[PDB]
Write a protein that binds this ligand. Structure first.
Ligand SMILES: Nc1ncnc2c1ncn2[C@@H]1O[C@H](CSCC[C@H](N)C(=O)O)[C@@H](O)[C@H]1O
Ligand SMILES: Nc1ncnc2c1ncn2[C@@H]1O[C@H](CSCC[C@H](N)C(=O)O)[C@@H](O)[C@H]1O
Lengths: 194, 194
C-alpha cells in the first residue's frame, strides 16, 4: 500500500511493457528513470517524469525517502534484476519497502535471436575464473559496452548482438582477437568450449 | 511473412503478456499450447486453440509443417527460452522458420522476489559438477518439480519459491536435508557457498 516504491522494467523493444507495469506507472505520482528507460515506457514527456543522470547509492536513497511522502516509481531499462540496481540496493538501510516489476531484458531478446536457453548460459555483467571456469559448463552471455576488453577472451569465436530492437541493430560474428566493438549496447555470446 | 511459425511466451502472472505477443496471437489461425499456457494467455476457450498434451519432437514437427499452410502460433508458459523447446528444436530439420517472442519467466518473478540479479546466478533446468562447480561462482536458481532429489544438495540452506503468482503461492526456507518438496512449480534458490 504505502511507504514503498516500485522499480519497474521498461522492456527492451517497443510494446514489451506489461499490464501491471502500466498500472503501476499510471498511478505513480513521480517517475524516475534514465531517458532511455522513460522513452521506452512512453513517459519521458510526462510531467511526473524526472530523468535520472546518476544511479549511485546517494541518488537512489533520495528517491527512496521521497517515496515515503509520495507514490514513486523508478523505471529501469529492460528488466530491473539484470545488471540492475540490485547491488546498490543491498547497500541501503531499508526503511521504505521496495517491490520489483519484471520486464523483458536484452538478455531475453538475445537468447530469442540465438535460439538458446537461459539454463544453458551464464549471464555476465561486463573475472579471470569467469572465463575458463564458467565456459567449462556454460556459454557466456556478456552484457558489455564498447570498453569491454576483448583480449580477455582470446581467439574465441564470439557473436555480438548490438542495439537489439534499436535503429542500428546488428548481429556480427568473428574472433575476439580480430573483431572490434563499437556499441555500448552489446551482448557478447561465447559458446562453451565443449 | 510466411512459411514460419511463432513461439510466444504467455508470461507467468496475469497481465504479463506483451503488445507484440497479443498481436501475433490475434493474427494466428491456429494456436497450440499446454492448457496453462493457453489459460494464461487468455485463449484456452478460443476456437483456434488446440491444447497440447505432448511436447516431443514428433509433435512439434507436426505443428511445424502445418505452419506452412496456415499461420501458427505456439504459446509456451512463461518465457520460451527458459527450460523451453530450444533443445528439441535443435533436433528438427528446419524447413519452416521459427521466431521466438519473449515473455516474463518464473525465473524473473523469483529473482524479483529475492532482489537478486540474473548475473549473480546460474539457472538450472531441474549434474554432479553443477553443484560444487557452479556454486563456486554463482547462486543456483533451479527450476524443479516435486521429484527433484534434494539429496543431491546436502545440508545447504535452500529457499523454495512455489507456485509464484498462483493461488497457492508459497515461499519457504530450510535445509535441503530437512525440507520436503510438494509442488511441481518449484524454484529452488541456493546461495553460493562463498
Ligand atoms: N538493446 C540492447 N541491445 C543489446 N544490448 C543491450 C541492449 N540494452 C542493453 N544491453 C546490454 O545491457 C547493458 C546495460 S545493463 C542494463 C540491462 C537491462 N536492465 C536489461 O535487463 O536489459 C548494456 O551495456 C548492454 O550490454
Ligand atoms: N509459477 C511458477 N512458480 C514457480 N515455479 C515455476 C512456475 N512456473 C514454472 N516454474 C518452474 O518452471 C518449470 C517448468 S520449465 C518451464 C518454464 C517457463 N517457460 C518459464 O519461463 O517460466 C517448473 O518445473 C518450475 O520449476
Amino acid at each position: 500500500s504505502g511507504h514503498m516504491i516500485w522499480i519497474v522494467g521498461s522492456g527492451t523493444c517497443r510494446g514489451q511493457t506489461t499490464e501491471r507495469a502500466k498500472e503501476i506507472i499510471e498511478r505513480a505520482e513521480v517517475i524516475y528513470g534514465s531517458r532511455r528507460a522513460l522513452e521506452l515506457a512512453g513517459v519521458v514527456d510526462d510531467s511526473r517524469a524526472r530523468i535520472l543522470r546518476s544511479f549511485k547509492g546517494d541518488e537512489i536513497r533520495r528517491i527512496m525517502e521521497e517515496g515515503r511522502e509520495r507514490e514513486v516509481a523508478v523505471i529501469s531499462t529492460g528488466d530491473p534484476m539484470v545488471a540492475g540496481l540490485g547491488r546498490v540496493l543491498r547497500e541501503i538501510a531499508e526503511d521504505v519497502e521496495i517491490k520489483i516489476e519484471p520486464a523483458i531484458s536484452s538478455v531475453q531478446v538475445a537468447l530469442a535471436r540465438l535460439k538458446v536457453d537461459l539454463s544453458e548460459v551464464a549471464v555476465v555483467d561486463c573475472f579471470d575464473a569467469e572465463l575458463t571456469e564458467l565456459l567449462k559448463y556454460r556459454h557466456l552471455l556478456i552484457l558489455a559496452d564498447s570498453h569491454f576488453p576483448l583480449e580477455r577472451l582470446g581467439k574465441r569465436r564470439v557473436v555480438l548482438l548490438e542495439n537489439l530492437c534499436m535503429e542500428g541493430e546488428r548481429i556480427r560474428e568473428g574472433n575476439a582477437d580480430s573483431i572490434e566493438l563499437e556499441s555500448d549496447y552489446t551482448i557478447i555470446f561465447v559458446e562453451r568450449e565443449v
